[PDB]
């Protein structure tokens, strides 16, 4: 298991939720399509960890993996203008590097927000620290792990 998922791990335990198990899947995994058949579910169950920076602080926002984020209803949610961040800024807030952010394990712990489209799952699999991770969670847990605000997000 790779220095990520080992870290992803530790840092579900050390929330109290390390009965949710990183899995590794085949190098050969970098797109959310191919992780979700890799273990069985629809790319809607995946959860994209993204993190964007604002005037006031930087902000996490779980995307359903079959929706995009709408930067629109973000902003009004989040109250600021909302903008894209670099390699560098990414790797420095969360710990992890662009492509495989989990959410949770933060240097930088994040105000966050979960498409609600989620909720629509019995189960969900997010970002193990790196593409070709992943531990799977209901709904619920993910909110009691980022204790993060349900809301509409997507395009429409």
Same mark, same amino acid.
């Given at each position: 298991?790779?220095?990520?998922?080992?870290?992803?791990?530790?840092?579900?335990?050390?929330?109290?939720?390390?009965?949710?198990?990183?899995?590794?899947?085949?190098?050969?995994?970098?797109?959310?399509?191919?992780?979700?058949?890799?273990?069985?579910?629809?790319?809607?169950?995946?959860?994209?960890?993204?993190?964007?920076?604002?005037?006031?602080?930087?902000?996490?926002?779980?995307?359903?993996?079959?929706?995009?984020?709408?930067?629109?209803? &973000? !902003?009004?949610?989040?109250?600021?203008? $909302?903008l894209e961040l670099?390699?560098?800024?990414?790797? +420095? @807030? /969360? *710990?992890?590097?662009?492509?495989?952010?989990?959410?949770?394990?933060?240097?930088?712990?994040?105000?966050?927000?979960?498409?609600?489209?989620?909720?629509?799952?019995?189960?969900?699999? &997010? !970002?193990?620290?790196?593409?070709?991770? $992943?531990?799977?969670?209901?709904?619920?847990?993910?909110? +009691? @792990? /980022? *204790?993060?605000?349900?809301?509409?997000?997507?395009?429409?």
């Amino acid at each position: 298991l790779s220095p990520s998922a080992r870290r992803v791990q530790g840092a579900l335990e050390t929330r109290g939720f390390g009965h949710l198990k990183v899995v590794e899947l085949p190098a050969s995994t970098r797109t959310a399509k191919e992780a979700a058949q890799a273990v069985g579910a629809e790319v809607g169950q995946i959860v994209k960890s993204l993190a964007y920076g604002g005037s006031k602080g930087a902000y996490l926002f779980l995307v359903s993996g079959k929706n995009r984020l709408d930067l629109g209803k &973000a !902003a009004r949610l989040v109250g600021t203008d $909302l903008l894209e961040l670099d390699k560098w800024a990414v790797a +420095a @807030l /969360t *710990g992890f590097a662009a492509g495989g952010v989990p959410p949770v394990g933060h240097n930088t712990p994040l105000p966050a927000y979960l498409d609600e489209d989620l909720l629509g799952y019995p189960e969900v699999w &997010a !970002a193990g620290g790196t593409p070709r991770a $992943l531990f799977r969670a209901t709904p619920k847990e993910l909110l +009691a @792990l /980022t *204790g993060a605000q349900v809301a509409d997000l997507k395009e429409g």
